[PDB]
Amino acid sequence: EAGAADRVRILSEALPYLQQFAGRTVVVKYGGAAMKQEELKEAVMRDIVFLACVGMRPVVVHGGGPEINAWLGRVGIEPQFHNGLRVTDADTMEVVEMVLVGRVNKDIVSRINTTGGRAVGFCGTDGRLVLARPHDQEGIGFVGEVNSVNSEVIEPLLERGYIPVISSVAADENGQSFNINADTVAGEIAAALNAEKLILLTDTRGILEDPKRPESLIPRLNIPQSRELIAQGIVGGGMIPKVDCCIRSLAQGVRAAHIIDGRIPHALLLEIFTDAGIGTMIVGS
Amino acid sequence: EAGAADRVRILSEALPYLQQFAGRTVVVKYGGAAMKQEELKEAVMRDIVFLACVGMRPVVVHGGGPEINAWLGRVGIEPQFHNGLRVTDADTMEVVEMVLVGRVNKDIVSRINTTGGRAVGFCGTDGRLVLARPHDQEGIGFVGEVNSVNSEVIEPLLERGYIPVISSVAADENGQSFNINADTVAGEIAAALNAEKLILLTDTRGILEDPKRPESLIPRLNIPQSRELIAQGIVGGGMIPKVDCCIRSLAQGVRAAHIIDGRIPHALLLEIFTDAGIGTMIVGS
Amino acid sequence: AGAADRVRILSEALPYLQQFAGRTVVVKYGGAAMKQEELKEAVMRDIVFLACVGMRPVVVHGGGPEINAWLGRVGIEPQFHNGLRVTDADTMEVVEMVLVGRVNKDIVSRINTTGGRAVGFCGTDGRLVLARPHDQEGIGFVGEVNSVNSEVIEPLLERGYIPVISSVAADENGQSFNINADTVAGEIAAALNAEKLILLTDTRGILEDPKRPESLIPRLNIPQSRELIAQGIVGGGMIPKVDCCIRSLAQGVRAAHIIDGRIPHALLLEIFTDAGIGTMIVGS
Amino acid sequence: AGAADRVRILSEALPYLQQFAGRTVVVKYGGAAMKQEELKEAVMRDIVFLACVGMRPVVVHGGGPEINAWLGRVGIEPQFHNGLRVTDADTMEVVEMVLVGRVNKDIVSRINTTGGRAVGFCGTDGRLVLARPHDQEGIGFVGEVNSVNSEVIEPLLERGYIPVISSVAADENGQSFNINADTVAGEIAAALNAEKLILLTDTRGILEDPKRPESLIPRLNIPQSRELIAQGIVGGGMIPKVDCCIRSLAQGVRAAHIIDGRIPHALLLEIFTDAGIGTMIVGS
Amino acid sequence: AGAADRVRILSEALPYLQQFAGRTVVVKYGGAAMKQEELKEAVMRDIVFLACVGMRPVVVHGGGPEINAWLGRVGIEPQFHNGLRVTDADTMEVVEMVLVGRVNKDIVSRINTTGGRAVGFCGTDGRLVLARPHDQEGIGFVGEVNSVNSEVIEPLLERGYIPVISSVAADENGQSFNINADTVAGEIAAALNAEKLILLTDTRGILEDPKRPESLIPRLNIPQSRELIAQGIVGGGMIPKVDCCIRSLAQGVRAAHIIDGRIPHALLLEIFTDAGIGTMIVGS
Amino acid sequence: MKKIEAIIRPFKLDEVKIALVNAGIVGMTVSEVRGFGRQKGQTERYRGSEYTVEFLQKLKLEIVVEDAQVDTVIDKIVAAARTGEIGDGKIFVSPVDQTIRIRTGEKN
Amino acid sequence: MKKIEAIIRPFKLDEVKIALVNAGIVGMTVSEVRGFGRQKGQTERYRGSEYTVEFLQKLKLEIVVEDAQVDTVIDKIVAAARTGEIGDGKIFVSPVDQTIRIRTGEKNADA
Amino acid sequence: MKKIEAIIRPFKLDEVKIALVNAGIVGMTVSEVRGFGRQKGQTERYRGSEYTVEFLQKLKLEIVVEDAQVDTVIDKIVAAARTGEIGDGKIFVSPVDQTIRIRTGEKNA
Amino acid sequence: MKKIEAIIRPFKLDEVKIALVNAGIVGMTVSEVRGFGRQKGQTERYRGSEYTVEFLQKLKLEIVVEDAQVDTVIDKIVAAARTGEIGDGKIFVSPVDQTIRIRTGEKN
Ligand SMILES: CC(=O)N[C@@H](CCC(=O)O)C(=O)O
Numbered sequence A, B: 001e002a003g004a005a006d007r008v009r010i011l012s013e014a015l016p017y018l019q020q021f022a023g024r025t026v027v028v029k030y031g032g033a034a035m036k037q038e039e040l041k042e043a044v045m046r047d048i049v050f051l052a053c054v055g056m057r058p059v060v061v062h063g064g065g066p067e068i069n070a071w072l073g074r075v076g077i078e079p080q081f082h083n084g085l086r087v088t089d090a091d092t093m094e095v096v097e098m099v100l101v102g103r104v105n106k107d108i109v110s111r112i113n114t115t116g117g118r119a120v121g122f123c124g125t126d127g128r129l130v131l132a133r134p135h136d137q138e139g140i141g142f143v144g145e146v147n148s149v150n151s152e153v154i155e156p157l158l159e160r161g162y163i164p165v166i167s168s169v170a171a172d173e174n175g176q177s178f179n180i181n182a183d184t185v186a187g188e189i190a191a192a193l194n195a196e197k198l199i200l201l202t203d204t205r206g207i208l209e210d211p212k213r214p215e216s217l218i219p220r221l222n223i224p225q226s227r228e229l230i231a232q233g234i235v236g237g238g239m240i241p242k243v244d245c246c247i248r249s250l251a252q253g254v255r256a257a258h259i260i261d262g263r264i265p266h267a268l269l270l271e272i273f274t275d276a277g278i279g280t281m282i283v284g285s
Numbered sequence C, D, E: 001a002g003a004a005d006r007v008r009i010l011s012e013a014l015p016y017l018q019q020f021a022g023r024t025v026v027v028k029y030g031g032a033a034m035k036q037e038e039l040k041e042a043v044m045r046d047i048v049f050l051a052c053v054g055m056r057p058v059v060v061h062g063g064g065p066e067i068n069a070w071l072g073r074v075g076i077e078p079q080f081h082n083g084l085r086v087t088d089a090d091t092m093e094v095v096e097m098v099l100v101g102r103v104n105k106d107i108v109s110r111i112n113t114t115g116g117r118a119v120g121f122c123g124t125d126g127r128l129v130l131a132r133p134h135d136q137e138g139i140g141f142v143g144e145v146n147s148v149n150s151e152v153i154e155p156l157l158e159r160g161y162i163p164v165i166s167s168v169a170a171d172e173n174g175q176s177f178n179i180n181a182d183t184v185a186g187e188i189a190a191a192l193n194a195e196k197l198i199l200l201t202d203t204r205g206i207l208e209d210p211k212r213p214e215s216l217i218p219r220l221n222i223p224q225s226r227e228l229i230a231q232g233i234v235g236g237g238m239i240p241k242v243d244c245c246i247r248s249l250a251q252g253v254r255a256a257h258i259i260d261g262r263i264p265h266a267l268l269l270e271i272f273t274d275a276g277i278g279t280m281i282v283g284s
Numbered sequence F, I: 001m002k003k004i005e006a007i008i009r010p011f012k013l014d015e016v017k018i019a020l021v022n023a024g025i026v027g028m029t030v031s032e033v034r035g036f037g038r039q040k041g042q043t044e045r046y047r048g049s050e051y052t053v054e055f056l057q058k059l060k061l062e063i064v065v066e067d068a069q070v071d072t073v074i075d076k077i078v079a080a081a082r083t084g085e086i087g088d089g090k091i092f093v094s095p096v097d098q099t100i101r102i103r104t105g106e107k108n
Numbered sequence G: 001m002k003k004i005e006a007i008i009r010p011f012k013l014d015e016v017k018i019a020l021v022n023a024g025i026v027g028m029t030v031s032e033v034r035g036f037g038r039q040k041g042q043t044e045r046y047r048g049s050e051y052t053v054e055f056l057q058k059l060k061l062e063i064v065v066e067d068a069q070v071d072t073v074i075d076k077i078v079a080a081a082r083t084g085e086i087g088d089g090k091i092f093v094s095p096v097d098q099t100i101r102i103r104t105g106e107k108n109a110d111a
Numbered sequence H: 001m002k003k004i005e006a007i008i009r010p011f012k013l014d015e016v017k018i019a020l021v022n023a024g025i026v027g028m029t030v031s032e033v034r035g036f037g038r039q040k041g042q043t044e045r046y047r048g049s050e051y052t053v054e055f056l057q058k059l060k061l062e063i064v065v066e067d068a069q070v071d072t073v074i075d076k077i078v079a080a081a082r083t084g085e086i087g088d089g090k091i092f093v094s095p096v097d098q099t100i101r102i103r104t105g106e107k108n109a
C-alpha cells in the first residue's frame, strides 16, 4: 500500500452530488423518530452542519408533539388530538410555545453550535417570519395556518452561512400565538425560500405501492400520480396531509419534495449523496 | 387661531435631542415594574418602536423572575433565591428557559410587531450571541455568567432597522443552558455593541443621596463617585449589583448608564428626550 | 413628580412618523413663510426635523419680492405679465444673482446652522433642471422645465443631505432662464417620485366658497379640481398653482398639498396633524 | 435495508472539512502525478473537490519531462546544470510554448471537464509573477521570482475559479524566463498568504534514515529542517525543495507539505486523512 | 514663447474621446500589423492608449504565418483548404503551442512593458470560448464557436485590464480546436455587446471598384454588404471577413470596421480621425 | 381594424420606430420578451453563443393600424427589422374592434 | 528629562488629554496598540467578552516631561484614566536625552 | 529596570507570546509597524516579492523586565522568533525608571 | 548607544528615509501615530482645516544610532523633514543598552 483508511476514494465519489446541489437551499422537517432517539438526533445535526459546511443552505423546521405531551402531563393538562391537529385551548397553547420555542428549538440550536455550525433559532413570530391565521378547521382552539411568510429576516443570515432553526409557532396580526402544523410550515418556508428540496423526516420508509409490502417503495411520483393515490386509498392515514404538504409546496415553486425514512441513521445524507432509496421523491409534474 | 392641537410646537422642541442621539444604539433592560403593569408595558413598546422609527438603534434585554415564579408553582417546584441569583437546579432551569425564551420573549416581540416595529427575538444561545460559563458563586446550580458576547449575529439585523429582543439565557460550550442575570447581560450586550446608553428600568426613582428622602435623587455620578457609595453604604440592597453592572459596562466602552424609574409611564422617552429626572446617569469618569 | 410632558405628545406622533417613514417630500418655500422671520425660522426647523426623523425633504424656492428689491437698486422696474415676470437679458442677470446667490445660500445657511446639512442647487447644476423658452410669447427669458435629471441629487439625498433648489435653469446653449418656482417644485417632485408635493402659500387652501373663509375643502382629486377651474371657484393664481399639482400628480406623485404657509410650522401641522391647513389633491 | 455507506465515511470528513473551511491551498502539480494518467486524473478530481467544498485551490506547475520531448523534436538536446535547466534563447522559446501552451491548457482543460472552472496563467499575465535573472551565472534565461502581484487572481479566486499557473515569467523588459516550479509555488503561496503549500513529489517525504523507507518524519519546523541539510540527511534535490518550504513558511504560510505524489489521490489523503504521505514543515 | 503646441491638436480629440467614452472595442490584431515591428509596436501603444483613456479594448489574435514557421521545424507541411487551415491531431498541438504560448504572451508582454496591464487568454480559460467541430467536413480539428462565456473576463475588464485572447478553444471533452481568429473576435465582441469590432487587415477596406483604388466604400449596412457578395465585388476572403462582421453586427454590435492594418497607428486613425482607413459596416 | 405585433431583435427597435413614425404612425407599445423559432432544425446566434431550443431575448412591438395600411406597413417593418440572419423574428396580424383614447374618449 | 508612556483604555483618551492640557502639557502622541497585563488567575472584560491571555485593543500615549513634573503628572493621568476594573493599563517612565522641534530647531536637554 | 522591544515577523507573535508567558511574563503590548534593515545590499522577501529599501509589515512587541531577566528573556524571544531568513527583526533594550499599575497604583521606582 | 525617534509629517517619510540611507543607516521602523503640540496658543493646518488641541495624523520613525552619529543625523533628519509650517514634528533621543539581530544573534 502503504496506508490504511481511504476513505478518500469514497469521498471523491461524493463529488458529483456535491456539484449537483452546490449552493442549493434545503428545508428539512426534523421530527419524531430522528428527534427522540439520540443516535439518530445526533446524526441529523452532523448531517445538517455538513451540508452547511459544504456550501449548501440548510434550514431546520421542527415541531415536537411527543415533547409537548410530556410537559402538559406536568401541569395537569391532558393530550387530545382531532384527526390531525392537536386540540389546543388558551391554556395548552401557552405550554406548546414554551416547549417548542423555549426547550426544543434551543436544544437543536445548542447541538448544531457544539457540532461546529452557527445555528440561529426562530419561531414564526420572529420578525413576522411566519404570520398565522386561525386554521380553517372550526372548534380546535388556537390551531394556526400559515397566512404569510416573510423571509426578509432569515435570508440575510442564510447568506452569512448561518443555520436557521424554525419552530412551528406563529403569532397572528393581534399578538395571539398559534400552534401550526410543523410539516406545512416547512413546506411554506421552503416555498418562500424557493428551496431546491423540502425533506420531511418521518417514521415511514416512504410511500409504499402496497402497505402490506415493505419493499414496494415507490422511488418517484409527480403531482397527478400523488393525487391519484389519495383517491385510490393507497396513500392513507397521516401520510395524506404529509403528501398534501409536498404537493402544496411543490406547486409554489419548490423543485423536489422528499418523504424520507428518518428512522435510520444519517437519513439526510443517504438521500442527498446516495442513490439508495430512503423515501419517495415527489416532483412538480 | 384657526386650529386646535399643537403639539407641533412641542414636537419641534424634541429636535435637539433627536439630533443629539441620532443613529445611536440604546440597550434597555425591560423588567419588573414596566413589565407587569399593562399601562406601563404597552408604553415601553411604544417608546422602543418610536426610538427605532426615528433612526436610533434600540435593543431590548429582558428577564422575568416574577414571570418564572408563576410557572414553577404550576409544576410543583418552589421559588428560592440566594442573596441575588435564583437557585436553579436542572429541573428548575428547564422552566426558566421555557418561560423566558418561549413565553416572555415572544410576548415582547409580538407586541412590538403589532405596534409597528419589526422585532426579532433572541436568547444567548442563538448564534452564540451570548456564551455562558458557570457563575463564580458555588452551589447555586445552573446560574450563569457571561463568558463572551458575539454580535456578528444581531448587528446585521440592527442595520436593517430590526429590534433585537434578547432573553437572559445562554448555553455553555457543551450545550447546557444557564440562567444569567438580566442586568449583566444587558450591560455585556451594551458593551459588545459599544452602545451609547445602557438603560436599566427599575422599581426605584434612581440612586438617592438619602434613602429616607425620596427627593434627594442624584442626577449624575461617575465611577469613583459610585464606587464610593458602595463603601459608605448609601448604595445598598440590590441596587449594589445594578450599580456594579453599570460600572462594569461603562468601563468597557459604553458612554452612559442610566438607572431609571421604570414605574412611571413612558419612562424611556422622559430620559432620552426630556431634562426631567427619572433616574441616576452614571458616566465613565 | 415631574413637569413637562413633551413625552405623551411625541408618543402620539408615532403613527404619522411610521406613515411617512423614509418617504420623500418636496416643499415649495415661498412668499409668506419666506418674508416673516418667525415663520422663515419655523420652516427651517420643520425641514431639518423631517430630515432628522428619516424622511427626505427637498426645498424648492423662488423669491419674486426678493428680486423686486435688487432690480430697484440697479434702476430697473418690476414688470409682470399674467403671473410670470417679463424678464429681458438685463433683468435675468439679477434674477439669477438674487435667487441662486443671495436667497438659496440664505436657506442653506439657516438649515446648516439649525443642524441639517443643506446643499444648494439651481437647475443648471449637473443639468438638474434643463430649461426651454416658455411657450408664452414675448415675455423674454422666462423658462419652462424641459427635462429633470436627478442623478445629481439622489446620491446626496441617500446620504441624508437636504437639497435646496432655486428655480433658475440653463438651456442647451448656456442661456439662463427664469422658471416659475411652483412648476419646478412639481417637476422635481415628479422626477423624484415624491410622496408629497407641498406648496406653501398665502391662502388657507382652496375654498369652496370664496366669501366664506370656512368652506375649506380638505381633499380633492383631479376631476374635482379640473371642474373648477371651470366653475370659476378656483381663480386668480390659484389656477396655475392647481394646474401644477394636477400636472405633478399625473406624473406619479401620490399627494399634492396647497397649505397655508402664513401660519407657524405650517409643514409639521400638515404632516403630523389632522388639523386643516390646506387642500390635499390626490391622483386617486 | 441498504447497501453503500459512503455516508458514515463522509460524515467522518466533517472535522477536516471544518478545519480548512475557506482556506487557500497552493499545490505544485508535477512529475509523478503528472505523467501517470490514473494519478493525473485523480489530482484534477481532488483539486475540483477542494474547490467545490469551499476551499481555494491554486495549481502551480512545471513540466521538465514534458519539455524534454519537444526539444528533441526541434533537434535540441536537454541540458541541466545542478537542478535548473541550461536554457538559451532558442530553448527558452520551447519551454514557454510547452508549459504555457500545451501543459497549462491540459490541466485547465481537464478541470473544466471535471466540473471546475479553471483559469490558466503564467507569470507574465497581469504581471502575476515578475522575473529577474537567476543569481546563478551562465545558465541562460533561468529566472528567479522578483515580485508577485496577486491583484489579478484574487478576484477570480473569490469567484470560485481555480487558477492554474505555469512557472514562466517575463522581466521588466519583456524577456521570458524559465523559473523553477517549486519556488513559484512557494512565492505564489506566500503572496496569497496560503494556509498550505503542498509539493507533489516522487518521494514518500523526508526520511530520517535513507536506508529505511519507514523512518518517514511526520512533522518538522524550520530549525529542525535547516539542521540537515547540515547533517546530510536531506540531500539531492530534496535540498532546494526543503529550501523552498522554509523560504515560503518564513513569509507567512502556515504549513508546507512535501507529499508522495506517486500514490492515487495524494492530496485528499493529506488534507482529510491522518495517514502519512509526506513531511509537514511548519513555521511553528 | 514656445514650441510644441501639440496641445491644440490634443484638445481636438475631445469630441471623439467623449463619443466612445467608456465603450468597449474588440480588435483583431493580425497579419500586417503583427509581422512588421513598426506596426506591431504601434498597435500596442494604441491599445494601451485606449485603455488609459477609459475605453475597454480587447485584443483577439491568430497567427497563421507564425504557426507556419514552427510547423516547418517539426517537419510538417502547411496546407490550406479555402480559408481554414486543415489541422490534424499532430498539427493542432503546434497551433496551440504557438498561439497560446508564444504569440499571446508576446502581445501581453509588450502591452505590460508599454504600461498597460494585459491578461492573456485562450477560449478554454474558464470556458471563455467553447468550441465545436467546424461544419466543414474532413478539415481535422478546426473549430467553430459553440458558446461564449464572458463571466471570466468582464470582471478584469472593469478593473481596467486588457484581455488578449487567442483563437483556440477546447470542446466539452477537452480536445483543442483551431478556430478562425476573425469569427472569435466577432463572437467575443457580440458576447461583450461591444461598440466596435475592428478587424486589422492587409486591405484598404472594401473597394467599390477593385480596379481601381481608392474607391473604398466608407460605410455599408447589412443588405448593402450582402448584395456585394452576390455581385462578386466582395471576393476572396474578404468574403468570410465580411460574413463575420454581418454575423457579429446582427447579434447586437453597433459597428464593425475592416481597416487597413498595414499603416502605422491604424486604430487611432479609425477611432479619433475622420480619415478613411477602412469600411465601416453597421447597424442599419 | 388590425393589430400588428412584431417580435424583433432588441437592437433594431430604433430603426423600426423611426421607420413607422416616418410612415406616420401614432401609438406604439414595446415589451421585453424571450422567444424562439428554429427551422427545420437550426441554431440561432445570441451574444456569441449558439442556441437550439432555448428562449432568447427579443422585443414585442405593438401597433394598431387601419385595415388598408396593413400591407405596406409590414413592408416598412420587415425592411427596417431584417438582418437576414437566423432569428430576425415574426410578425402577427389580428383584428381589433375598438380603440379608446383614455385622456379624451375618442373611439375608432 | 523623562518619557511617560501611558497604555490606556481607548475611551479614556479625551479625559486624559484634557487633564494634561489643564496640567499644562504641550507635546503628545497617541498610537493604537493591543495589550494584556493581567492578574492570574483572573480575566479582563472587553466588548462583553472575558479574555485571559489574548491581546486587547488599547492606546499608547506618549508625552515627554521635565524631571520635576513626573510625580504629579502620573497622579494626574491615573486619576483621569482609572476605572478600577481589570485592565486599566500601565504607565512606563524612561529617560530622554534631547528634544528637537523640527520647524524651529529648539533643542532641549538641560540643565 | 529594562524595556525589551522586539520587532518581529507578523506570524510569529503567538509563538513568542506563548514562550514569554511560559517564561512567566505578566504585562505586554503589540503595535503594527513597518520596518527594514538593509542586509548588505541584499533583498528581503515579503508576500512573494523581493524588496531592497522599502518598508515591510512587522510587529513591535513591548515588555518591561527586571534587570536580571534580560539575558535569558532575549534567549527565549530569539529562539521563538527566528526563521533564519533575511528580515527576522531586531531586539532593542532600554532603561525604565518606574512602572505604575493604573487600576491599583503599584509603583516600581 | 541611542534611539532617535522622529515624529514627522506623513508625506515626508520618503525624503527622510532616502536622506538616512544616503547618510548610511541600516535599520528603521515606522508606525502610524496621531499627535499634537501647539505654541503658546496656536493652530496647525491639516487637510485644509485649522486645529487647536485635537490629535492629527503623523508618523513615528525609529532608528537606533551609534552615540557619535546623533548630532549630524538629527541635522540630516530636520533638513529633510522640515516645511517650516506649524506641526513639522519633534525628535526624541533616548539611551539604548543592547541591539540583537534575531536572524543571526549579533549584539551591539
Ligand atoms: C417666471 C417667474 O415668475 N419666476 C419667478 C421666480 C420663482 C418664483 O416663482 O418665485 C419670479 O418671480 O421671478
Ligand SMILES: CC(=O)N[C@@H](CCC(=O)O)C(=O)O
Binding pocket: D030, D061, D062, D063, D064, D065, D067, D083, D084, D085, D095, D142, D143, D167, D178, D179, D180, D181, D182
Ligand atoms: C529552471 C527550471 O528547472 N525550470 C523547469 C520548469 C518548471 C519545473 O521545475 O518543472 C524546467 O524543468 O524547465
Ligand SMILES: CC(=O)N[C@@H](CCC(=O)O)C(=O)O
Binding pocket: E030, E061, E062, E063, E064, E065, E067, E083, E084, E085, E095, E142, E167, E178, E179, E180, E181, E182
Ligand atoms: C482555421 C484557420 O484558419 N486557422 C488559422 C488560425 C486563425 C488565425 O491565425 O488567424 C491558422 O492559420 O491555423
